[PDB]
Amino acid sequence: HVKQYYFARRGETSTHDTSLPPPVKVLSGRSIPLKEIPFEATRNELVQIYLTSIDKLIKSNKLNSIPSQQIASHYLFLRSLANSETDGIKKNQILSLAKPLGTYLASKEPHVWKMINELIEKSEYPIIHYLKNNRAHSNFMLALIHEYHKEPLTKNQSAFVQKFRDSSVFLFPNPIYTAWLAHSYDEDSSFNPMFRERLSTNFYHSTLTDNLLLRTEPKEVTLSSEHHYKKEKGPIDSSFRYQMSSDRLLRIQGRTLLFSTPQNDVVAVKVQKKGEPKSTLEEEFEMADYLLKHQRRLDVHSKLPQPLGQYSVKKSEILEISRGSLDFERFKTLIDDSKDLEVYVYKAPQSYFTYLHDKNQDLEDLTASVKTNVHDLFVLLREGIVFPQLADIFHTHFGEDEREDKGRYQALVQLLNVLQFQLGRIDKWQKAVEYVNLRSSGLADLGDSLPITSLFTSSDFTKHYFSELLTGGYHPTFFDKSSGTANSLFTGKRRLFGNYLYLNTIAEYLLVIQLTLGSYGDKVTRDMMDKPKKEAVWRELANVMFTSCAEAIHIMTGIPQSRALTLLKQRANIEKHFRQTQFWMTPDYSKLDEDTLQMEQYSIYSGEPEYEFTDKLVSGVGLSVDGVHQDLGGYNRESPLRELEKLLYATVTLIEGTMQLDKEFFKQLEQVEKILSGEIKTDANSCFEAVAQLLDLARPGCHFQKRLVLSYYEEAKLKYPSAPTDAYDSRFQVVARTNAAITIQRFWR
Amino acid sequence: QLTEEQIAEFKEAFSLFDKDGDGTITTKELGTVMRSLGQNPTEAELQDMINEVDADGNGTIDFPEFLTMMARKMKDTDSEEEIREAFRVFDKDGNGYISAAELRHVMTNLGEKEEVDEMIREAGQVNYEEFVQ
Amino acid sequence: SKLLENDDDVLDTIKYVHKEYLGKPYPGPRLPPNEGPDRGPHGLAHTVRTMACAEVMIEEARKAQLRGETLGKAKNGQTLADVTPEELKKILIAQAFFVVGRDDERSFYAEYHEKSEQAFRKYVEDNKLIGKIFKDQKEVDFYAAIILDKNHEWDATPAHILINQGHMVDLMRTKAPAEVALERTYNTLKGTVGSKGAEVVLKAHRDFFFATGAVVPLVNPEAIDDPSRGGPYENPYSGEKFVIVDDKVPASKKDLPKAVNRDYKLKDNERFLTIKEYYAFPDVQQTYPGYKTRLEASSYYFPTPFAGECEQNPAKCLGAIQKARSKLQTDAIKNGFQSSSEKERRQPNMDEIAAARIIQQIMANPDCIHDDHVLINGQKLEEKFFRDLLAKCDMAVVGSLLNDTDIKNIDTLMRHEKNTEFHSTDPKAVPVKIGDAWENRIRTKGGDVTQMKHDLIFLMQNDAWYFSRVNAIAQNRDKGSNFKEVLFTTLMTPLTNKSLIDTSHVPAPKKLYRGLNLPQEFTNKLINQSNAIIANTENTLFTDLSAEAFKQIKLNDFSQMSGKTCASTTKNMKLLTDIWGSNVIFEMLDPDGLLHPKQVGTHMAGSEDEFSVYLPEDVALVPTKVTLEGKTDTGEDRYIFTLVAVKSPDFIPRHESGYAVEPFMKMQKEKVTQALDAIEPALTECGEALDKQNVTEALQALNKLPAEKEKQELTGNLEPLAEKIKVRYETLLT
Ligand SMILES: Nc1ncnc2c1ncn2[C@@H]1O[C@H](COP(=O)(O)OP(=O)(O)OP(=O)(O)O)[C@@H](O)[C@H]1O
Ligand SMILES: Nc1ncnc2c1ncn2[C@@H]1O[C@H](COP(=O)(O)O)[C@@H](O)[C@H]1O
Ligand SMILES: [Ca+2]
Ligand SMILES: [Mg+2]
Ligand SMILES: [Mg+2]
Ligand code: NA
Which UniProt keyword terms apply here (chain C) (predicted)? Predict the structure, then answer.
């Protein structure tokens, strides 16, 4: 009977734009100020322009000149917008605007009218159900605006249009967009954020996440006074000392001496590094104790280290005890130069010192270890602890100190930068994870952490690695000579960057997992000949990656892992991911001629453009700038792992969209409860519309939410016994039938 | 114990009704969770549940405690009458007639989704009291 | 012209029909399959080849119509050049199902097509295409009737002609007397798409055969390989033959006797007409183009393993067809000009060394510049000299020649200059003091010449007031520029090229994009020139039309719009389409690596994928297609021109030499005269004075001077200092 709860709470703030660099650009000695373009106001005025354009279309009598698909789209969107509206005048105006379209559709095209009526009877926002397929790739609102609106667009509207031209869903109001985004992952959805224009193929999976994030409110995490980062921990002054024994020395790795114990465990002594002070060691000690104490509350599955002491020893002793090691010189150069070195002593099992990509693990042990590591990572993220140093993933090393990302890899580079369009190459991806802080037992380097609030403020980490996001976005085309400012939508993220960095942290965790799995697969299959089993290895690794993403979704949102995996597989293809990881993470392709490499790439990228690169392959390595260590992608090119990017964006989008959909559902629920209990006086039709709307905002694949909505509907029917309910009876009957079927299937056992 | 599907549903509902995501829900929204899971409580019983557990002063329930409370509430709440309520939902006519093909279709497409070919065998008129045996 | 290798509809249709039916062996009519379960002669590759043939026929009919030729009409009266792209998509979706319902190779036909039509109905009913792809049941039943082919009316509608002729062209392989089969196919094609069009269709589809690893027989109208056998005429598709008299072989096709069925018994020692004798007739020679063409064979006699690979992978077959039909057009373009020995930039020529030396001298002493000329020890260089130097010198090699001193001497050059440089494209901007801007803003404190290179490149990329004027002067299209900015253009272009060459070290992309903003009249002129070039690039099977392609290309080439200037390009078209808002885009393809792009590193947003191209003298950008991809933000039409870079000595402009040497020789004479008059003993002087006097009468001569010299600076300065053409010209005259 121990309470299992987190010490961190979630809430909202007005803005993250507090105590961060001013919005200016110093270009050629000139200060150019930077300003924001309001997303919501621009979107709303664009919708108003669309309504006026629809009025013009009605007056112009050219309904028969337009395809029936566009007329159906306009009609369904108008009905959905009228439903979402609250003001009576606006709702009536929109309904009158839609009436002639419905009359025409019923008259001259009954076939589509039948499906329109089905959708109207099936949902309160029929447009989202109508658009969950390739139809969404057609921008009917923008087409109508450009056709019937002769006045030029303002600079704000032009910017909004040039950033969000892919689809009309980007112009929907918040609840409708959130509902459509949530339902686009459903089982009966064929939507894919990709369309093939005449020249090339346009992927815009990241634009969905950007348009979602621009609609949210700033997030705050509040840490309880009992939290590790809210406590004035006392001194670590202790009397315990460890007895060095060169006889018992198991080995040396990095800056750590491993000695055996009669209990079959390992005592590890971590010697101070050159530049790191005592603060790092004491912080690691404190974090280890904090995690060990609270393991039951947080439900962490890792075999956590047991610290023993953090004190100072003579360097000569360290040298004397490590004489017989096979790696004595490297250890000598690593450790500090002072005569007395701070050390941190702990006790851990054998598996704590074997990296998760070790080749001496069978697939089942690797699966278990990966599951443990992912669970611990994301549970601790929910606890308010971030691990920005699991691995050292570098995009590039050339101008590292000059460029604003400092050469660090950004898993969501499209969201965090101006005029970046897709993920770049990974420099020496093998050695990025060779000393990864994920082990066969669980998390290892616990001291190298940050509070989660460090992401939502202008801390040293945020200011060091994300200054383009914190400062603002500048480009010469943004400059407005009339005002002298640079207006872009990117600067508007100054008040929300915490959410972006949260999603980036999740994506980077998953990317580290992917690279570790790839390294394991490459090492295992390097000395193998039987091709089918070599393929089976990579197929299993792909399944593990997808399961890890689904587990992350389940922990962050609460969706069951099976449904999370189904929703993920809707948007990301495991076959392509397996093929691409197998192709690019091994050196085989380096032994092929141009024609053969292209012929195989045809099979790797099924239905998509093949990876293009002009780099010269290194024999036995592949793509490598330094000529020794392979890297993922050509120089100045994007990454060849397309399904990996799709999977990362699908994961983060699912998490954030689920949270936003929950918020919308609960505000609608509060309105419904107010109406039912009497604080709002309205006719029966209004109450029925409110409950139907609530039914539309429920989570896809979740039933208990619809159960609550149906109970509210029945209460409403009791409240107004003398009103018709023909419109909503069908959908609520479907809900009731599902409830009964579930009850029967349950009672069977 | 509870079923795996039941535990998954309870966990998802608990997460959905945990507004600030600390791992616990307050007393105000416990009734909403109960109603959401089908066990709509009376005012007296709901007030009893609010007072008894939350007299600790903290006023929050963690997931294991919620599981215990629901397992208790489900110890004796669903007798055979509630079980046959769902069977009667399909009762288009009062004769207790349901085509077995209709049961197969509803159990496959409209519910949890090969099991039906074995369920039906143990199961054209399907009298309701016949099967609940 | 259009390529439907991008329409997702047809791709998923192919994937479907392969997954269900085209990917399965023959089950038989059951009965034993005549040829066994192979599904080869009618598998997936056959259908894809037929669809590609239909696409090529559409394109070729369009090009023939544009050239100004009249095409055959169907019963409906609609030529093959009047098929809208959505109509073509529908026709391809229909054609994918033409032979899906085949269970055996035996000639039955009705049942097979009934099964294929049933499969078509099932597919078009199980994917809701009735409301999305097709309009209504009317058109679906129309295409169902097309697939069924109940009657042999094959020329009523464009779809009829396309499907039937594609099937015939793909089945032409199996016909026994290959020569007459090819002749019949050519005549059938030319009845609808013209002569040149039929020839290009046949060549493209033979290349399709080879690409997918099919077996192609030997065609020999002359019967050269066969010593003395000779093949009987035996016109296939009918089986008819011609019977000759003892020795009265007709001199022409007109006097031949009536046709006889396949089943005929020879009498009175008669013989059948021979293929070789048929193709000796003057009538066929004047009416048939391929009466001597010899298309050899496929070396293999059984289908290659690549055909099997294609059978269970439509992607590989589609890729092979795409490569084949792209290299066809590329070879057609390249066949009209001479070959290129190499790809790298040319070595310095005579005048380029003198030009580089003069530029270096001007760098050394800015005082030589004057308000209206340059004074180099007597020589008075005027803007015309610098202009023709820009218009007759390859500034990339000049920039390569210059050593590292000039980059530093830029400091003294800008220090001595505080003049005015005007913004070209718009006259309502503010004049800028180039030297003050360089010393204050552009230049950065510290840094070695390795940093001045970057500063110069940054100035070139940004500062519209600078590069607009510089590009206008370089391309000789400016309006009212003074002497100082002309001189600055001439000096900076080679130095910018040197900085780009030294600083850039990344691999060169093969595709580049360039954005331009032009009036609609100029765009229409460009479109007309592009269409003229495109419609005359033909890879024919029988006849050679290289001369016509050469003429049309050399008459309507607009590759000078990109030459003479360090043109900026981006390898990300999205950047041009979205933010830069350009109404014209040039897409430059460089598969051979003939452009040498250099990365422009300016540390600005989106600029990592920006490169600078300086078009070589002997490279031309030949259009290959023109596309209308939507509209700009304003609303005007956006046009994309795809260009292929082709290198050939047929593009070099003939420049009279000595432009940069004559003034250089005058300068050397001035130096010699200065030194000699300063020398002003006699007995000892004579030995030197004799050669010092003899050196002076060069008068455009360089050999004797070093011999006279054998004033060390002046000698150190002096030291660095067939059948196809005749055939094409005869064709042009004739
Ligand atoms: N297992 C190892 N084997 C060899 N060299 C290593 C190993 N681990 C680290 N090193 C080297 O030692 C350097 C310093 O170690 P580092 O700072 O990475 O330790 P750490 O991550 O805190 O250790 P741990 O995860 O074991 O607690 C590294 O940069 C690397 O060069
Ligand atoms: N930090 C980063 N992590 C991952 N990809 C990046 C990063 N920065 C840029 N990219 C991408 O890498 C490619 C090269 O860009 P750059 O490195 O900025 O010249 C482009 O596709 C960029 O979008
Ligand atoms: Ca809570
Ligand atoms: Mg570590
Ligand atoms: Mg560490
Ligand atoms: Na790179």
Answer: Coiled coil
